[PDB]
Every structure is written in C-alpha cells, then in structure tokens.
Design a protein around this ligand. Structure first.
Ligand SMILES: *[C@@H]1O[C@H](CO)[C@@H](O[C@@H]2O[C@H](CO)[C@@H](O[C@@H]3O[C@H](CO)[C@@H](O)[C@H](O)[C@@H]3O)[C@H](O)[C@H]2NC(C)=O)[C@H](O)[C@H]1NC(C)=O
Ligand SMILES: *[C@@H]1O[C@H](CO)[C@@H](O[C@@H]2O[C@H](CO)[C@@H](O[C@@H]3O[C@H](CO)[C@@H](O)[C@H](O)[C@@H]3O)[C@H](O)[C@H]2NC(C)=O)[C@H](O)[C@H]1NC(C)=O
Ligand SMILES: *[C@@H]1O[C@H](CO)[C@@H](O[C@@H]2O[C@H](CO)[C@@H](O)[C@H](O)[C@H]2NC(C)=O)[C@H](O)[C@H]1NC(C)=O
Ligand SMILES: *[C@@H]1O[C@H](CO)[C@@H](O)[C@H](O)[C@H]1NC(C)=O
Ligand SMILES: *[C@@H]1O[C@H](CO)[C@@H](O)[C@H](O)[C@H]1NC(C)=O
Ligand SMILES: *[C@@H]1O[C@H](CO)[C@@H](O)[C@H](O)[C@H]1NC(C)=O
Ligand SMILES: *[C@@H]1O[C@H](CO)[C@@H](O)[C@H](O)[C@H]1NC(C)=O
Ligand SMILES: *[C@H]1O[C@H](CO)[C@@H](O)[C@H](O)[C@H]1NC(C)=O
Ligand SMILES: *[C@H]1O[C@H](CO)[C@@H](O)[C@H](O)[C@H]1NC(C)=O
Ligand SMILES: [Zn+2]
Lengths: 677, 136, 67
C-alpha cells in the first residue's frame, strides 16, 4: 500500500507539473478547463522545502497526539484512558456530574494544551501556503471546493458560501431554540441543582465529549418512554436474515425506483460477512470504486437494524459511484464534498420508515403507528441532525475567522467560548484561558479536515428527499414518505447522479430540487410535527438562553484592582506574571486558612485558583477548586473567610491598601477609635 | 584523594543561600515559618524569574513553584534554593542570571513578607542604600 | 509505574523495560538524571503515605506478636 500510494503521488505531482503548460485563460472547453483546474492545483508543493517539511511534521505530530492522548484518574494515576475506548464510554454512558466533568476537563487540559502551539504554527503555515496559491487565506482555499465560474447564471463565488450558511442558519435557529429548551428542561430532572432553567447547558452534559451529537442524550430525553421504538432485529433473527439477504433486499429496493442492478463481480468480491479471527480486517463499512467497473463494499455486517441502514447507505454510495462510470477519471466524484453523503443517507432515511418495514415483511401488517411513536422517532432524528448544525456552523465560523486573522492569536478561547455561548447555547463548566486549545481537540480540527461538509450535507439530503417525495406523489408527512416503486423519482435522481463533477453542483441541484442554491425549508417541513409538539410542550418553560450564567458564577469571587490610583506613578504593568503571583497568594491564603482553622493539610497550587473574565480594569472572577478534584469547588463562604484571615499579606504583596484591592463582598474593618479616659 | 566529603553536592555551585530573620525585623506579631510560607517564597522566586526572563531576554518561560528547589532548611530559616528549567531538570539556570533576577525584583519579595533588605539576606546580592543628595 | 518524557508526553516508560535500559546503557548525564528524577518523583510520592501506613500497621502487628 505504501509503495502504491507513493507511486500514485509521484505520478500525480509530475502530471501537475506538466499540466502548467496550458494556461486556463485560453481554454474554452468547460470540461477540459475544469479537468486542468483539478490537475493544476499546486497544494503544499508551492511552499519551500523547510516549510513543507515543518507542515508535514506538525500535522503528523497533531494526529499522533490526538490518537494516543491519555488521561489518568487522579485517584489512581497508574491507570490511564485513551479517547476512543473508555473516555468515550464515560462521556456517553455515565450519569455522574463529577465523573463527566473530570473526563471533559482532563481531556481538554492534557491534549489541548499540547495542541495549542502546534495549531498556531499550522495556522501560520497553511495561511502562507494558501496566500502563495492565490487565495486570501486558508479558509478561502477550503471554500473553493464550492466555487463555480464561467456558467452565466450558475456562478457561485467562494465568499457567497458564508452568506448562504448564515442566512440558512438564521432559519434553523428558531427550531434549535425550542429543542435546546426542551433538552434543558428534561436534563434538569437528571442533574438537579446543576442546570439553571434560564441559563445555558454545561458543556459536558451533552452526551458526548465535544457535544457535536446529542444522540446519547436520547435516553434522558425520550418523550414517551412507555412506548417502545420500532425494532425489527428480532424479526430478522426469527426469519433467519443472515448478512447475505439484507443486501439483496436493498438491491430490490434500489431497482424498484429504476436504478440499475448490481454487477456480477460485486457479490463475488464483497466482504459482506466478517472473516472471523482467522483473517484480520477493518470493520468500518466502506465503499470502494477501484475503477474499470470494479465496485465493492466492506462491512462486518451483523443482524441488526443499524447494519441494515448502513448497508442501504453503502449501496447508495456505490450506486452514486456507478452513476458516473462513463465520466473521465478526474470526474469520477460527486458534485461537491456534500453530495455523496447526502445521496447515501437519503436511502437510509427512506428505508427506516415503518411503511417500508411493513412492506418488506419485517414489521407485522397489523401494526398501527401512534403519533407518540412518530414524536419519539422525530426527536431521535432531531438529536442527531439538528443537534450538530449549530456546533458545525460555530466551529466552521471560528476556523474561518482564525484563518482570516479576524481573531487575534491571544484571543482564541475568549472568542471561541463567547461564540459557543451565543450560538450553540453551551457554557463551559470551568474557565479556559488562552493556554487551552479546546477546538483543536476535535478529530476534524487537529487532522486538517474541512468541517463545513457536514453542514451542507445535512441540508442537501432533505432537499433531495422532499423532491423525491414530490415525484412519488406522497400526501402524508415527510418523515413517512417512501420512494419505493417510484420510477419517476429514480429517474430524477439518476439524472443528477450521472452528472458527477462534469457539471456545477448548482446545476446538479437544479436537476433534482429545481433550485440553484441550498434551502433549509425542507428541514423545517420534515421537523414540523416535532416542532409543534415542542412548542406546545414549552408553554411554561423559558425558551432561549442567556449568555451570562455560568456554573462557576455562584462560587466566584470578583476582584477589582486599581494600581494607578493607589501608586500614581512608578506603577507596574499587570502582565501574566502578576496574575500568577496573585493566584499563588490566593493559594497560600487558602492553605493558611485550611491549616490554622480546620487543621487540614490541603496542598493547593497556583493552578487551583481559576480566573475568568479578565478585563483591562484588572477586574476578574476567581474561584478555588480542590487540589486534584475539579468537580469539587470550595464554597464561597470558606474562601471569603480565608481572604479575611490573610488579606494583609495579599495587600502587601502588591503594595495595595484595601481600596485598590477590592474583593466585592469582603468589607475591611478600619478599627475602633480609642477614647480618652 | 581517597575518600569523600559529605558537603559537596552537584547543585551547590548554582545554589543561592537565603537567611531570614523574622523575629528581629518584626519583633512581636511575627508569623511562623511553616510550609505555606516556603510555598509563598518559592512562588515569589518563580515570579521574579518570570519577570526577568520577560523584561530582559524577552522570553516567555513558564516557571512554577516546583521549579525552585530548596535544600538545607534550618530553624534559622536559612536554606539554599536554585531554579531549574520549567520542564528540563537537567537544565539549571546559572547563578548570575538568578542573581540579576533577584536584584531586579527584590522589592516585591521584600514586601511579600514585610522584610527590608536586612532580615531577607541572599548572601551575594548586596542592596544599594541610595546616593545622598547634596545642597546646591 | 510510568514515566513520560516531557518533550513527548504521549510516550511513557515502565521500569523493567526502557527505563532500566536507559539507566544501564545511556552515557548522557541529562537523560540519566531525567530518568532518575522522574522515577523518584512519579512513584516515590505515590508510595510515601502508603509506606507510612504500612510502617504503622506492621509496627502494631509486631508489637502484638511480642516484638
Ligand atoms: C470531588 O468532590 C465531589 C464533591 O463536589 C465528590 O462528590 C461526592 O462524592 C461522595 C462519595 O460518593 C458522595 O457521597 C455519596 O452520595 C450519594 C448520593 O446518592 C449517596 O447515595 C452516598 O451514600 C454517599 O453519601 C457525595 O454526594 C458527592 N457530592 C457531590 C456534590 O457530588 C467527589 O467524590 C470528589 N471526588 C474525589 C475523587 O474525591
Ligand atoms: C536540558 O538542558 C540541557 C542543558 O543543561 C540540554 O543539554 C544540551 O543539549 C544540546 C542539544 O543536544 C547540546 O548541544 C549539542 O552538544 C553536543 C555535545 O557534543 C554537540 O556535539 C552538538 O553539536 C550540540 O551542540 C548541549 O551540549 C547540551 N548541554 C549540556 C550542558 O548538556 C538538554 O538538551 C535540555 N533538554 C531538553 C529536552 O531541552
Ligand atoms: C470538451 O472535451 C470533451 C472530451 O473530448 C468532449 O466530449 C467528447 O469526448 C469524446 C471522448 O473524449 C470525443 O470523442 C468527442 O469528440 C467529444 N465531443 C463530443 C461532442 O462528443 C466535449 O465535446 C468537448 N466540448 C467542447 C465544447 O469542446
Ligand atoms: C504552481 O507553481 C508553479 C511554480 O512552482 C507556478 O508557475 C504556478 O503559477 C503555480 N500555480 C499553478 C496553478 O500552477
Ligand atoms: C438483478 O439480479 C438478480 C440476481 O442477481 C435478479 O434476480 C434480478 O431479477 C435482477 N434485476 C432485474 C431488474 O432483472
Ligand atoms: C395523538 O393524538 C391524540 C388524539 O387526538 C391526542 O390526544 C394526543 O395528544 C396526540 N399526541 C401527540 C404527541 O400528538
Ligand atoms: C412495491 O412493489 C412490490 C412489488 O410488487 C410490492 O411487493 C410492494 O408491496 C410495493 N410497495 C412497497 C411499499 O414496497
Ligand atoms: C477590624 O475588625 C476586625 C474584627 O472586628 C479585625 O479582624 C480587623 O483586624 C480590624 N481592622 C483593623 C483593626 O484595622
Ligand atoms: C542603589 O543603586 C542601584 C543601582 O546603582 C539601584 O538599582 C537601587 O535601586 C538603589 N537603591 C536605592 C536608591 O534605594
Ligand atoms: Zn458515507
């Protein structure tokens, strides 16, 4: 594999060097022009040797750091947890606030801090490479995948993508507000006294490490738990559905709409069943288009509904791949990065309907679906689909603003968490200064992957599905629509599938949805039955969130420092070293109080005094945690008593006297006035 | 030379000796020198090192309270401290740079413990009283 | 017990493999000093209170056994 990849890369780069002999200014054929554009992009080769090597080194280092990151329990440091096993289970299964908070903070303090300088260097190098490749910044190069030129009406500028994303998200926000309100109201019953009904959700209580998906929260937010979900795995087991006839049923479903049959060698070369322990193989369901009419599917398929839906998704992928077989090699791909996954996912969405299960025989014919079951299914779909849209948009906006330079390097987290509060509605449980690099902890951020693809793909599929339901002449709700036995819908889909990349993606969209740009109206039409139920359910609850409440705001003590007024001239600047000294003084005062009052030896440190909301006034909020227990925060009364006990030392450490060092809750005593006899 | 001496140590060359006389400077109302005071002193030394490395060499070195190693503690409150690299134990800051850092920010350390240049002796850092101004 | 290189905290070394090889083969003063201090600061500190409790309990048992 390494040799083949190296040979392919060498051939591709030498062909790219050769292709520069034909400038695009004199090319008139559209297909030839775009094929040359594919073969003329320099990529990382435009940089110097040292810069290219540094970029490769930092990319590999970030990938390895993310892959092999370890967090160790403070109680038993001898045991440590990776990310894929254990930590994901902790974040997706545990109901303990303390354990989830520990996992969240440990992962974001043991891996983000290591990825901060590497991500800074990566940003600088990628910006230089993109500017060398005639792009304003790296974000422009990323958005260039959607760029369309020279079509007289279908042209799509790179900058128009930002406008299209923001305008679309403005229409998703009303639904997400109600969904967030319902989720918060339901979570208050599971984590009492930790979630405020007026404030935002804590970051770690989202059923995932980063909060990208809310699927794992479905157990805590099921609308009607008494009514079971639709499961036909038992029916498959009773009817003895091995991992050989489910693909046959999927093929029949694809044919029913008019799509062509599978190739003869597809079944022979497939790996529909796991080869056991004798042969080792990956179990990620993937589609392979080896070329020359060679299409294969790899999957360790079991007897489960999830496996059935995944098989339908992979069959959609391979059908799309087969659609553009006649296209040249450079055109053997989708219209853009979002078309392929949407085409794959619409099949899974259609196959999961109870009507299809009843027709195929998995669901009993004497089964009448209730509206409660529909609400449960819609909410389960929503927690996965609508849950990730605000997070995806916020992450991509933050990355675009970082690459464009609109966010200063010393203001990354301060702006990232501010965006997360006011867009996603998620508040950090503990403050993070500029040392942390939380966004870099995500898989798609550290490994240099475009994230906007997951946004538009969410839209396109719905725009496809609705369109496929118009040709099929479906009168019921959108979520109940099925495209089986609809030759017109299959023909309409194939008309776009066969195009591939030979045509602009806008033209491909027009061939299905009849529009040139993405529209979120199909998503709202899909989620309307759930939207009405959520609106009716939130009669008493306060819909929305406030960007001021934080979980640590109750135990925070506010410090305001006025150096200039107390010292006049000869006043030192309040840099980070002064903040470190102040945190050390606070930790010393806490140690003194815990030793001379409670007679407990607690080894506080400068990292246990967390500081937030730093301002040029030198006015911030600090709170003291346990020495190695992040979930434990010292109550504000004890901290106030500690500060009162040893305020003189802190005052003398900075040469301030009780007026330029105000703790806003600790009122000093001037002293009784002695009287004559 | 056959044998060995029980006084030489590898860190003795780069160690700065601190002698503190709380009772003489404060008389009564003098706090006890427990481990918390030692932690505060180490934090002050780390802060001074940060200030010197930032305002002279323009290098951001994240020192910590665990990078100021202290040995030979005595009831006189007389010990030897030396500062290492932030995460490189084998790297010890040369004594000249530590002396320059202490001279740069001795006032803050003096005020942190309410001592004045006589009860906080660094044994190698001699303070300057100040030139005496003369009439015209 | 595990000690991890500060340059690459993602890699860590046990005692029987690696660390013993470092202490028995390396001729670098810096590397040997790092290994020594890392092992005695990442494992001794965890064994201090446990050893104190072990000392107290063993003393009580021995005194109960007429020693
Ligand atoms: C870090 O600090 C937190 C406190 O902020 C500690 O959480 C506390 O853990 C104890 C031990 O499990 C809990 O006591 C138990 O509470 C359950 C609740 O049903 C009760 O059934 C048990 O009988 C027992 O009383 C305590 O409630 C809990 N407090 C909070 C606020 O969660 C945590 O243990 C600390 N972590 C470490 C490693 O020390
Ligand atoms: C921790 O600090 C020590 C210094 O106390 C660092 O040791 C130094 O490492 C550099 C890099 O290898 C050495 O430079 C090299 O020296 C060899 C000696 O033959 C020479 O051949 C090379 O061309 C190069 O100049 C330097 O001599 C060495 N200094 C000492 C006193 O050992 C150590 O690298 C630091 N550790 C980390 C992780 O930064
Ligand atoms: C642009 O080039 C393509 C590629 O040649 C043309 O498509 C056909 O390609 C086949 C095989 O390469 C040729 O045998 C045909 O002669 C090409 N033309 C037609 C009409 O089939 C395409 O036509 C070209 N378009 C323009 C506007 O020149
Ligand atoms: C790529 O680099 C070459 C030189 O290395 C340069 O001539 C060319 O303009 C660059 N851009 C493209 C699109 O080829
Ligand atoms: C597709 O192939 C299967 C067997 O491989 C066959 O039973 C089926 O009839 C074929 N489809 C059509 C439309 O002929
Ligand atoms: C389902 O329909 C019944 C019949 O009117 C109604 O009482 C109930 O509230 C509905 N439930 C939902 C979730 O729409
Ligand atoms: C589609 O056509 C097949 C073949 O006649 C039939 O069995 C099935 O009931 C029809 N409807 C659906 C929803 O599959
Ligand atoms: C003010 O009174 C409080 C207790 O009444 C005392 O701790 C504090 O030292 C007094 N401040 C003075 C005397 O300056
Ligand atoms: C003594 O002189 C030195 C330099 O000559 C100076 O840094 C220090 O502040 C002086 N001390 C005073 C004036 O008290
Ligand atoms: Zn896929």
């Amino acid at each position: 594999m390494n040799n083949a990849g190296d040979k392919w890369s060498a051939f591709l780069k030498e062909q790219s060097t050769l292709a520069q002999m034909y400038p695009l200014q004199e090319i008139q054929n559209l297909t030839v022009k775009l094929q040359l554009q594919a073969l003329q992009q320099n990529g990382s080769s435009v940089l110097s040797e040292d810069k290219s090597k540094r970029l490769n080194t930092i990319l590999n280092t970030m990938s390895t750091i993310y892959s092999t990151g370890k967090v160790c329990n403070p109680d038993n440091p001898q045991e440590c947890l990776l990310l894929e096993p254990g930590l994901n289970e902790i974040m997706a299964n545990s109901l303990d606030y303390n354990e989830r908070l520990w996992a969240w903070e440990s992962w974001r303090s043991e891996v983000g801090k290591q990825l901060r300088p590497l991500y800074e260097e990566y940003v600088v190098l990628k910006n230089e490479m993109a500017r060398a490749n005639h792009y304003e910044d790296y974000g422009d190069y990323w958005r260039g995948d959607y760029e369309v030129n020279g079509v007289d009406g279908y042209d799509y500028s790179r900058g128009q993508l930002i406008e299209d994303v923001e305008h679309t998200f403005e229409e998703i926000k009303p639904l997400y507000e109600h969904l967030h309100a319902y989720v918060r109201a339901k979570l208050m019953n599971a984590y009492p006294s930790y979630i405020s009904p007026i404030g935002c959700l804590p970051a770690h209580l989202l059923g995932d490490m980063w909060g990208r998906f809310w699927t794992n929260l479905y157990s805590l937010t099921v609308p009607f738990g008494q009514k079971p979900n639709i499961d036909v795995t038992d029916a498959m087991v009773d009817q003895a559905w091995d991992a050989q006839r489910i693909f046959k049923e999927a093929e029949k479903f694809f044919v029913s709409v008019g799509l062509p049959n599978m190739t003869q060698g597809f079944w022979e070369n497939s790996m529909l069943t796991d080869p056991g322990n004798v042969q080792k193989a990956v179990c990620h369901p993937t589609a392979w288009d080896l070329g020359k009419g060679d299409f294969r599917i790899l999957m360790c398929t079991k007897v489960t509904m999830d496996d059935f839906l995944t098989a339908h998704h992979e069959m959609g992928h391979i059908q799309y791949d087969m659609a553009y077989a006649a296209q040249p090699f450079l055109l053997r791909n989708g219209a853009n990065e979002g078309f392929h996954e949407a085409v794959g996912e619409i099949m899974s969405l259609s196959a999961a309907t109870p009507k299809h299960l009843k027709s195929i025989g998995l669901l009993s014919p004497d089964f009448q679906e209730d509206n409660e079951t529909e609400i449960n299914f819609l909410l389960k779909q929503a927690l996965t689909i609508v849950g990730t849209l605000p997070f995806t948009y916020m992450l991509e906006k933050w990355r675009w603003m970082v690459f464009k330079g609109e966010i200063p390097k010393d203001q990354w987290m301060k702006k990232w968490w501010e965006m997360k509060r006011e867009i996603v509605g998620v508040v950090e449980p503990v403050p993070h200064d500029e040392t942390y690099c939380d966004p870099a902890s995500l898989f798609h951020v550290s490994n240099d992957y475009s994230f906007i693809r997951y946004y538009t793909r969410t839209l396109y599929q719905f725009q496809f599905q609705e369109a496929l339901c118009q040709a099929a002449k479906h009168e019921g709700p959108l979520h109940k629509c099925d495209i089986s036995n609809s030759t017109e819908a299959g023909q309409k889909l194939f008309n776009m599938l066969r195009l591939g990349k030979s045509e602009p993606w806008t033209l491909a969209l027009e061939n299905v949805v009849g529009a040139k740009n993405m529209n979120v109206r199909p998503l709202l039409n899909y989620f309307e039955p759930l939207f009405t139920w959520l609106k009716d359910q939130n009669k008493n609850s306060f819909v929305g969130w406030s960007t001021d409440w934080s979980p640590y705001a109750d135990q925070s003590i506010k410090v305001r420092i006025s150096l200039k007024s107390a010292l006049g001239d000869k006043a030192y600047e309040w840099n980070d070293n002064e903040m470190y000294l102040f945190r050390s003084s606070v930790a010393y005062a806490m140690r003194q109080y815990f030793l001379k009052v409670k007679n407990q030896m607690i080894l506080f440190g400068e990292e246990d005094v967390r500081v937030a909301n730093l301002k040029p006034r030198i006015s911030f909020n600090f709170f003291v945690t346990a020495p190695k227990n992040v979930s434990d925060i010292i109550p504000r009364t004890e901290v106030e008593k500690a500060i009162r006990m040893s305020r003189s030392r802190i005052n003398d450490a900075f040469r301030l006297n009780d007026n330029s060092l105000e703790f806003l809750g600790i009122q000093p005593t001037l002293g009784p006035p002695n009287q004559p006899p």
